[PDB]
Copies of this chain bind each other. A is one copy, B any other.
Amino acid sequence: AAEASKKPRQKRTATKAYNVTQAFGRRGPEQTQGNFGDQELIRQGTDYKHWPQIAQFAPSASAFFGMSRIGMEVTPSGTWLTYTGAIKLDDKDPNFKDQVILLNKHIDAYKTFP
C-alpha cells in the first residue's frame, strides 16, 4: 500500500497488501538485515494465521527501551539507533514447546528458498 509505506520503517505493519519484503526488505544474513520469516509469513505479515503466537514475544515501546542495550551510531548513511537484547521464553508455559517450534520455523527460514 502507498499509505502503509509512508510510515517510518519501525512503525510499519506488514500485511498481505504490504508484505514483509515490501515493508522491511528481503530476508538475509547481513548484520542489520532481517532474518525472520518463512515464505508464508513473508507473504502475509500480520495476516499470518499464527501471528498472535509470534507477537506475544514482541516488546512494548517501554520494554524495548527498558530491556535493550541502546546506542547511537553516526555513519555515512545517516544516524542510527542500534539495539540489542534478549527475551526469555517461559519454560513453565504448557505451550513452551510449540512456541520454540514456531519461532525456529521462521528464524533463518530464507536459507531454504530463493
Residues of A within 8 A of B (CB): 8-14, 20, 23-24, 31-37, 45-46, 54-73, 77-91, 96, 100, 103-104, 106-107
Contact = CB atoms under 8 A, between A and B. Distances in A.
B62 A45 contact: yes
Nearest to A33: B69
Contacts of A81: 57, 86-89, 103
Count identical subunits in the complex.
Answer: 2
Q: Report whether over half of chain A's contact residues are helix, strand or loop; otherwise say mixed.
A: mixed
Given A10-B57, A54-B65, A60-B11, A82 B77 contact: no
B61 A86 contact: no
B9 A72 contact: no
Contacts of A59: 10-11, 58, 64
